[PDB]
Design a binder for this molecule. Sequence first.
Ligand SMILES: CNC(=O)CN1C[C@@H](C(=O)Nc2cncc3ccc(F)cc23)c2cc(Cl)ccc2C1=O
Ligand SMILES: CNC(=O)CN1C[C@@H](C(=O)Nc2cncc3ccc(F)cc23)c2cc(Cl)ccc2C1=O
Ligand SMILES: [Cl-]
Lengths: 305, 298
Amino acid sequence: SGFRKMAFPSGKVEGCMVQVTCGTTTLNGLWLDDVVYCPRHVICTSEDMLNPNYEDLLIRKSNHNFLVQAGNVQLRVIGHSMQNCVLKLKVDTANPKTPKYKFVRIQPGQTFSVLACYNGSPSGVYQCAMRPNFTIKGSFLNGSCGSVGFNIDYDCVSFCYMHHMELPTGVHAGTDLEGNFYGPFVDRQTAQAAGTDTTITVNVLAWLYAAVINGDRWFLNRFTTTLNDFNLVAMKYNYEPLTQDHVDILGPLSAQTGIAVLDMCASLKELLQNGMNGRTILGSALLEDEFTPFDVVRQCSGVTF
Amino acid sequence: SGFRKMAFPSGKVEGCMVQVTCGTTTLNGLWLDDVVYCPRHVICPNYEDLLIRKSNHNFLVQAGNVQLRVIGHSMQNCVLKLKVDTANPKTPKYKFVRIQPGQTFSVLACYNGSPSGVYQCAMRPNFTIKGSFLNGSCGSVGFNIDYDCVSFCYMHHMELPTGVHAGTDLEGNFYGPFVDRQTAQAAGTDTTITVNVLAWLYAAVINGDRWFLNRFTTTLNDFNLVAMKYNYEPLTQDHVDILGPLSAQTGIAVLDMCASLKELLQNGMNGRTILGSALLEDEFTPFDVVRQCSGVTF
Ligand SMILES: CNC(=O)CN1C[C@@H](C(=O)Nc2cncc3ccc(F)cc23)c2cc(Cl)ccc2C1=O
Ligand SMILES: CNC(=O)CN1C[C@@H](C(=O)Nc2cncc3ccc(F)cc23)c2cc(Cl)ccc2C1=O
Ligand SMILES: [Cl-]
């Protein structure tokens, strides 16, 4: 019993965090095998950030301009290349702590753990989701750039995010580990703003099934809905449209609890209409959208209470 | 910017988790130096009588894919200490510390000696923790990190009928009036950790959420009468002193913030949120707020 926002154990990622310094800028790097991955904006000054020509800044650099520190040990940079918005520093030592890993690009609604780091040293771990507007609502201060997002299903670490910047509203933007940004963002200090955000509907439904599993049914009703009528209502509350893929994905949780997806969709419509009336669902007075159907199945029991 | 429920990096604890099996029971153990610590209920009660029957080879300890040989066993309160023939090469610098209600810690949830997740939680005033644990999680541990030293403060033992959890410090002393046996046990009426809600209100102000601030101030006496009415823990002068730095950083005196909290308790949030929450959050200590709004590393 219980339901917490749970992050993956961070040990396999801690053993990869390094500090990367180029001139006056210091940020975090990810050391896997003999390569250190970091945001390419480590080569920029704050002045350069408005309209930086990264190719022009990079050509002026040599290997010895990049200082890489792993713990109390200086790593020697023997090569460098840029791939999209990520800088790849070839080092002369393979990381003995390199876990089994993959680089995966995630879609909005997907969750991951973030190991927040400063000066190559990990300070904390939290769980979050890629918002529909491609931003993440993280907790990052200056010096956190290069901190990474990941999932660990089995013994393999799947790296999905690298932190690059904070937008004016306090939300965060970054790239996959191949340096492609999530969202229409650029690694420039130009006027950029997160688009209007929406609620991840398939995740709220999954979290309503988690409440049923843990023994709570106060929010259910005797109604059903068509998928189209559900979407016509939910879009009026800034909820993402629910697709047939989402309905298919919720199939296992529907079979475990005995509640059809479109019947759970009807409880959701009523919750949006009425509010909670002083009640909570899994200790929350808001509808939670940062748990995927996969997270609910992973954390919850196989036997409904 | 941003404010998340953040746990300490779990790597130093992951390197200590082992699987302990005795008969049909399998649970988690903490391997530090040449000793494995685990709940004594792995032998299940008259624990001294059940333990005397057991021999070293009855305890099967597995660290990864390696079997550890048990060479001795002893009981300390509700914790079993299994002497093994190999010191854990991954043993971090550590201490065993007992925490007080209101203090927070990270939990590394484990199954079959394998860590599955890490979350942050608080020791409730009724000594239970609102964790997320399934069957097989017994022996999972709670900890904090100060500099490079891991302070182990909790070991999981059981789930109560309301779905909340009970356990011991690493010396086997239970937190709360609980016993390690399947008997009629219930968590007492819980209260809200007032000093923690105040710290989280200061964190909201630091992050630009100021709608709840008002021109009023109050007294400890007046505020404590309000806190007692709303099932909030009493606020002591020690709590006020502890909130001193956050009060100096934001310019809001602790009794000035108490008047905001009093107004929130008597009138609610009015459709508004604070740090993305429609409830008053009490699982961040004043130290957690200062650490997360400063970026302290380990
Ligand atoms: C809020 N940002 C700024 O005032 C200056 N700024 C620096 C840098 C940037 O955002 N770093 C930060 C990252 N994450 C959390 C941050 C919290 C606070 C903070 F001051 C800086 C953070 C940056 C990188 C890129 Cl690729 C593009 C633009 C910028 C940029 O605008
Ligand atoms: C709810 N538990 C039970 O009905 C059986 N039960 C087994 C065991 C215990 O609580 N383990 C569990 C721990 N954490 C989450 C658990 C989720 C579900 C679960 F069935 C068992 C969990 C236990 C240990 C001690 Cl020291 C004393 C009493 C008991 C006990 O009563
Ligand atoms: Cl995905």
